[PDB]
Every structure is written in C-alpha cells, then in structure tokens.
Curated annotation (Swiss-Prot), chain A:
GO terms for molecular function: mRNA binding; U1 snRNA binding. It is found in: Nucleus. Residues 105-186 form the RRM domain. It comes from Saccharomyces cerevisiae (strain ATCC 204508 / S288c). Involved in nuclear mRNA splicing. One of its GO terms (cellular component) is spliceosomal complex. The chain holds residues 1 to 188 of 300 of the full protein. This is U1 small nuclear ribonucleoprotein 70 kDa homolog. The keyword Lyase does not apply.
Swiss-Prot record, chain B:
The lineage of its organism: Eukaryota, Fungi, Dikarya, Ascomycota, Saccharomycotina. This is U1 small nuclear ribonucleoprotein component PRP42. Its main location: nucleus. Component of the 18S U1 snRNP particle, a subcomplex of the spliceosome. HAT repeats lie at residues 6-38, 50-82, 84-117, 120-155, 162-194, 254-287, 289-321, 365-396, 455-487. It is found in: Nucleus. A motif (Nuclear localization signal) lies at residues 229-234. Essential component of the U1 snRNP particle, which recognizes and binds the 5'-splice site of pre-mRNA. Together with other non-snRNP factors, U1 snRNP forms the spliceosomal commitment complex, that targets pre-mRNA to the splicing pathway. U1 snRNP is cotranscriptionally recruited to intron-containing genes. Required for U1 snRNP biogenesis. Keywords: mRNA processing, mRNA splicing, Nucleus, Repeat, Ribonucleoprotein, RNA-binding, Spliceosome. It comes from Saccharomyces cerevisiae (strain ATCC 204508 / S288c). Signal peptide: none annotated. One of its GO terms (cellular component) is nucleus. One of its GO terms (molecular function) is RNA binding.
Length: 186, 539
RNA sequence: UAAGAUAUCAGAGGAAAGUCCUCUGAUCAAACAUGCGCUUCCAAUAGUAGAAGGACGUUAAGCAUUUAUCAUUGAACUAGUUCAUUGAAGUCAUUGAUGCAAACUCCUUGGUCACACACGGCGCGGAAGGCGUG
C-alpha cells in the first residue's frame, strides 16, 4: 500500500497485505428495520380462564413439594433450639454452686486446664489477695472439669487486681493453658 | 456563506471573464480551476452543494474543450471519489477512456488501481483486465500495467494455473521492462519441485515431442527433473534472445529519441526530430502487421502532436490502402477535423473519401456547413485554399443535381448563376483576394461553341469594359484570353488566326505592353511562329 | 472494574450454639499408567487405477428464464402511447444476475505396511473414540 498511517516503516507495513475485498452476497435474513419479535400477543383471555377447568379437573391435587419439607425440617429445628435454650434461661441466684459471698468479690476464671486442681488455682489466685472461697465447676452430667472456676476474695479490690493482672495478662498460664479471667458476669 | 462570498470576490469575476474571452488558451482554464478549489479548501461532504455543482461544471466543461488531458480525467474522478459517489467516478473514467478511443495507458492504469477497491466481484474484475490488455497490452511502456494484473492473480485466485497462463504472454511482448518478467519466470522454474508441476507450464504432449521429457516417468526422478529444468530453461533463453533483439532495436532507434509522451496544449510546439521519429516509428509499426499494436502506436503518437494533421493524414492513409477499410478512414478525419488547427489538408482529403464511398448527401450537407461558417461569403475568404477546395467540390454536385443547359452533353460546370456569381464576386476584389489568375485559368477549360461565346462576353469582355487596371497589366490574363480562343473546336485556323491578331492583340495599351509582353510572347513563340514579327512591331 | 474463593458430602477428634483445623469413609474431577476376542478407519502394481475433500478452475456469450430509473411542462394520439424540454437521486454489471445439468483439467490428504492368490476373525502398527481397574 501507498500511505500506511502506522507505527511501522514502509517495508513492514507492506508486509501485512490484506486478502482482497469481500465478495458481495445478497442477504437472506430480515432487514434491521423490519426485525421484531412476535407482536400481537393475545393476552390470557377469559376464554383461556374458561378452559382452565379442563386442566383443573384433570390434576385437582398438585404433587407434594417434598424439597420444601427439607427446609421446613431445618427452620422448625432452629425454633426448637431456642426452646431448649428457653428451658435453661429460667433456671443464677439458685444454682446452689454460685451462692456464697458478695458477687463483687467473685472472679471468674476460665479456660483453666481440665487437669488443674483447686490447690494450683488457689496458689495463682492467692497471688492477688486472701481467698475466701474457690470452686472449680464440673459438669453435673459427668464430672469433666468444665474449664472454669469462681474465686471469692476477701476484698473486691483484690478481686479486680487479680482480674487486671491474670486475665488481661494474655491469660494466666496455669499448668499448660492460657486462662482468661473476668468478673463473675452471671 | 462560502459560496456567495466567492461570487462577490473580485478575482472570480476576472478569471471567469478571461476564460470566456480566450477559450483555448488553457492557462486561464487552469487558473479558473486551481483558484476555485482553493477557495473551497475543506472539500468534504460538508461543503455546500452550490459550491460543488459549480466546481463540477468547471471540470466537465473544461474536459469538453481538451479531451486529451489524461490527468484531469483522473483528478476529476478522485474529487468525485472523496466527495463519495463512486457511481459518478466510474462514469467519468468511462468518458475518459472513450475520449482516447479505449487505448490510453495512464487511464487504464489509474482506472484499474481504483477499480480493485470498488468492484468487489471476482469474475467481473478480471473482465476489466481482459478488456484492458487487448487495447493497451502491447504498449511499449505497459510493463507496469501487467505488474498490476499479475499482482491481482497471485493475491486473489487459488489454482495457480492462470498465473502461468498469463505470464506466458508477457514473455513474447517487447516491453521496456521485460527483464523483470523473465526474472519472475526463472524464479518459478527453479522452485518447481515435482514432475506434475510441469503440466501447468505446457501440455503433456508438447513436453514429450518438442523437448522429450515425460511426466509419467516413474523411476529415480531427481536427476530427471534436474534435466527437465535445464532442457526447459533453454527455450526460455532462446526466447530471451528473440525479444531482446526486438526491444534493443526499438529502444536504440525510436524510443530513445522521443522526449515527450503527453499532451500539453494547443499552444505547445514539438521539436523537429521528435516529429521525425514519430513518422518513422509509425512506419516501422505498420511493417510488423500487429493491428492492436498499430492502432495503439498511432494513438500513442497522436496525443503529443494531435494538433498538426500530420498524423491524422497518415493514420487515415494506413487504414485506407493497407487494411482496406475506407469507411473507417472517414471516421479518422472526422475525429481529426476537430483537433487539428490547419484543417485544410484534411478537409481536401476528407471530401475525396466521402466521394469514393458514395455518401454524397453527407458531402452536400458538409458544404452547406462550411458556407454557413463564413455566412454565405466563402467567396470573400482570405486563405484561398478553403475557397478553392470548396468550389471544385461544390461544382461536382451541381453538375449532377441540375441537368445541363448546353450542347454536346457538357455539364455546365463553373458556368452556372449560383457559382459564377460567387466567382465574379471573387474576381471583383482584384488585388486583395489573392487567388485570381488560378481561378481565371480554370475558366478557359470549356473548348466548345456555346461556352466560348459565353466566357468571352460574360467575363473577358466585361473585364475590358469596366477596364480594371490590375488584370490588364498582368500578362497571365492576356495569355489565358488567347488560349480560350485558339483551342476552340468550332473555329477554323484562318479565323482563329484572324480573331486573335486583328482584334485581341490591338486592345492592349502600349504602356502595359512592357510587362505583358514576356508572358504574351510565350504564347506566340510556341503556337504562332509565322506571326511573331507582327507582334514586335506593334510594341 | 472490584472483592472473595480453590471439590462436595458425611462421620471421629482439638480450640448447648456456630466457626476454625485435623485424620477416617462415600461421591466428584484431573493427570498418568494400564487392560479389555470393545467400536470405527487406515488407497491399483497380477496395475497406468481409485476414495475424501476442494478449485475463490475450464467448457461457457452452455442451455432455460426474468431484469434496466421517478417527477414537472408542451405536441400529437386513442377515449393508455410516442417525441422534446426542466428537476431529483443513480454499486458495478446484461459476455450480467437467477434456475438446470453434464464433461474435462488441476490441487491437498493417506500404512499406497507384512503374509497370502489361497472355496461369517482372533499378524505387527498408527489414528480416532467408548468402557474398566490402579
């Protein structure tokens, strides 16, 4: 070609020779102006709603949506989950096991090793003031140590200094586990 | 707007009015156009239709004055191309090719280049090239035309049997650049890599007869195909010996000398040697007897000296006696009558061609068209030849149309009231009309009783009675008046010797008898030796 | 243009609800091997062939069809038709386009393999799948 308005020089531009012009062929589809989807869509007639009864008498009972019952199984199971939780929330001023002296004196300790003892618990927590009581909590259904305890100090300032120190300090290492501390919460 | 601002401009009114004053000068047509394009400088589909229709009628009226301007037919299509109607771009190549009578190289080259892009149909686009080559294929500079055609075969077609078929022709033609086509043949022959591929060169038979090589030779082919090439490459080389002789002849004798191959104008003048080679290059081309190559080489030599008549005569002379086609020679002069500026040597010959062809109603119509040109005063013309060629052919019709009014079946020739009054009005001018005695000498030619008594009384007596000075001092007049009398078949020798010597000789004046005597002695010295003394004593 | 993610499922385990993570099953997928009396295909020389695909090749102006602008003004005209003038656009083509058919020429492809010229398999490959195990 002569002009070649391209980045390349004249040799490289003449190298991309195009195949000669496309032969013309008289078109077979519809012209772009005339193109349209089917118009004159006769609406859902009264005569159609009159001929529904031939269909309705034939299939009067529809088939059961059993794939919906897989969803009605799960959603109703989640509501029954709340009712077992509702059975628990009615049952802390009762438990006997949390019903010694002032709740402002009570530390929660949690994540304690399953294989701690109250004497090692007492050692660590007696670091922050004289103890009035301990109790590790154990599963009443079979006495797996639950991994929490409640520790009543002679003063709430020593209970909150024990809290300070041995929970926000990453969790007090006792035996081999990292033991959160909180106040009673409950 | 841009249109009306150009009309109210001063330079438009002066450049237009200049062209209508001096049409054929061209350099005013060229300024009228070169200006009017620049004044519409953005020339796209945008610009207003009054400005485009005006720039279309400049071109189309300008090519109607100068039909041999190859470039302005190209340049007018490209303007119709960019403006964007390729219908109207074709139409004005068609009108350009027909102007040259289908056989001009630059048009067919710069038509086909364009025609590649817009035809978009296989069988028809090659039909343009087939029609092209039969007119302008043998043109000596056609080298670059074929290089287009071979570019369009390779590119387009699939088979590769047409590419060998066409290239076999270009090998036999004496083009300027022929060696570029033997180089392409020899780049193929080498790249032939199977014996089946020698069938596309030439037939299965003519290989085995003329060269003795066989395609069905099953064996160890390598050396056999290495032989076939060496045997086949040879007869190319013998053809390269043939053509090269024809080219190097034509280059060294003719084409080397011809420095101008284009039109220019009616004011351009060609060199003397350039005319000398075109006259010889045309005679050489007649010898070859290649009719396509002959017609082309007249047309090719016409457009540089299209105004002379020198080539319009020969091109009709070739056609009239060699190719023996007289009706075709009539059309050349009619096409030549327009371009040439002498117009006289043609129109003498052109009358004669019509007469032999027996188309007298045309010629009588043609003589009416040349008397109507001067407004019934051909008699009064300055250049005698137009009158004299008119008169003798105007005579031939009125001998035929009107029956004769004299004895012995003599066609009342120059003596008829229609023509003789044109002649008598011509004689009356005397000193300025400048073709007097030659007209007078053909009035002698009647040689009978009635017609001598006519021409005596109706011209030779009345010329004495009015007594114009110019005619009586010119001895060619008195000589013709004696020869009118002497060769009359009616008179005997006695009265013919009386009537001249007793009456005609004494009517001259003694002062004129100085300058009349030399031409008047010559009549006497040859026909009347007996009465040569009686001449001398009188003067 | 951006964000997120790198098979799904189920069970046991570690940090009542869910998430995160790990080994055990099922199913799904890919790659690689490897089998199936698995399926289909792989061209004369004992001859100058032939199979698949083409030709944007020829015969070929084949044969048979149908196509070549509209508006304005005047004359003649039957009771539409032709001629001339003024404006509008206008792919090229009429050797066309559309339909019908044949003949010829030429191009690309392959196991032109081995054994045998012998009255409904189980030679050595290559190509293409289907199916099954690891």
């Amino acid at each position: 070609m002569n002009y070649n308005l391209s980045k390349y020089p004249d040799d490289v531009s003449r190298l991309f020779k195009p195949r000669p012009p496309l032969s013309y062929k008289r078109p077979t589809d519809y012209p772009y102006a005339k193109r349209q989807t089917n118009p004159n869509i006769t609406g859902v007639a009264n005569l159609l709603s009159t001929s529904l009864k031939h269909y309705m008498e034939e299939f009067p009972e529809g088939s059961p949506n059993n794939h919906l019952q897989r969803y009605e199984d799960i959603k109703l199971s989640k509501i029954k989950n709340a009712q077992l939780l509702d059975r628990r929330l009615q049952n802390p001023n009762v438990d006997p096991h949390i019903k010694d002296t002032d709740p402002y004196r009570t530390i929660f300790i949690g994540r304690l090793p399953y294989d701690l003892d109250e004497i090692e618990l007492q050692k660590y927590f007696v670091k922050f003031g004289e103890i009035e009581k301990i109790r590790i909590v154990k599963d009443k259904i079979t006495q797996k140590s639950k991994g929490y305890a409640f520790i009543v100090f002679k003063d709430p300032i020593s209970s909150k200094m024990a809290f300070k120190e041995i929970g926000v300090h990453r969790g007090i290492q006792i035996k081999d586990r990292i033991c959160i501390v909180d106040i009673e919460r409950g | 707007d841009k249109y009306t601002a150009l009309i109210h401009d001063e330079n438009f009114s002066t450049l237009t009015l200049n062209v209508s004053r001096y049409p054929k000068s061209l350099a005013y047509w060229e300024k009228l156009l070169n200006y009017i394009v620049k004044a519409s400088a953005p020339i796209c589909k945008s610009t207003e239709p009054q400005l485009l229709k005006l720039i279309r009628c400049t071109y189309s009226s300008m090519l109607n004055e100068f039909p041999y301007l190859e470039n302005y037919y190209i340049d007018f299509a490209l303007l119709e191309y960019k403006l964007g109607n390729v219908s109207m771009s074709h139409k004005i190549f068609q009108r350009g090719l027909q102007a040259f009578n289908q056989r001009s190289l630059l048009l067919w080259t710069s038509y086909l280049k364009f025609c590649n892009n817009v035809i978009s149909h296989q069988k028809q686009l090659f039909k343009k090239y087939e029609t092209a080559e039969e007119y302008v294929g043998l043109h000596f500079f056609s080298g670059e035309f074929w290089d287009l055609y071979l570019e369009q075969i390779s590119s387009r077609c699939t088979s590769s049997k047409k590419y060998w078929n066409v290239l076999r022709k270009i090998l036999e033609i004496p083009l300027h650049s022929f060696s570029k086509f033997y180089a392409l043949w020899l780049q193929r022959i080498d790249d032939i890599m199977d014996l089946k591929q020698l069938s596309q060169l030439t037939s299965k038979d003519e290989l085995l007869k003329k060269l003795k090589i066989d395609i069905n030779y099953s064996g160890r082919k390598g050396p056999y195909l290495q032989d076939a090439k060496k045997k086949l490459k040879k007869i190319t080389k013998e053809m390269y010996m043939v053509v090269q002789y024809q080219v190097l002849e034509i280059y060294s004798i003719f084409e080397s000398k011809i420095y101008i191959n284009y039109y220019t104008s009616p004011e351009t003048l060609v060199s003397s040697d350039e005319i000398e080679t075109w006259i010889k290059y045309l005679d050489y081309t007649i010898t070859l007897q290649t009719d396509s190559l002959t017609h082309l080489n007249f047309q090719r030599a016409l457009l540089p000296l299209a105004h002379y008549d020198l080539v319009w005569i020969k091109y009709s002379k070739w056609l009239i006696n060699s190719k023996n086609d007289l009706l075709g020679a009539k059309n050349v002069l009619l096409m030549g009558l327009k371009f040439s500026l002498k117009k006289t040597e043609i129109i003498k010959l052109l009358y004669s061609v019509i007469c032999k062809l027996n188309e007298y109603v045309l010629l009588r119509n043609l003589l009416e068209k040349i008397e109507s040109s001067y407004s019934d005063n051909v008699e009064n013309v300055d250049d005698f030849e137009i009158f004299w060629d008119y008169l003798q052919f105007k005579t031939f019709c009125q001998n035929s149309l009107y029956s004769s009014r004299y004895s012995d079946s003599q066609s009342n020739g120059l003596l008829n009231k229609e023509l003789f009054d044109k002649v008598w009005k011509r004689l009356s001018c005397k000193e300025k009309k400048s073709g007097q005695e030659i007209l007078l000498n053909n009035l002698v030619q009647f040689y009978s009783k009635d017609t001598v008594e006519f021409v005596e009384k109706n011209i030779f007596q009345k010329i004495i009675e009015f007594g114009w000075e110019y005619y009586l001092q010119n001895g060619m007049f008195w000589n013709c008046y004696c020869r009118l009398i002497y060769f009359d078949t009616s008179r005997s020798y006695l009265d013919k010797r009386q009537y001249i010597v007793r009456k005609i000789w004494p009517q001259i004046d003694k002062k004129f008898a100085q300058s009349v005597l030399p031409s008047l002695t010559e009549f006497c010295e040859s026909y009347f030796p007996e009465e040569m003394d009686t001449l001398e004593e009188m003067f």
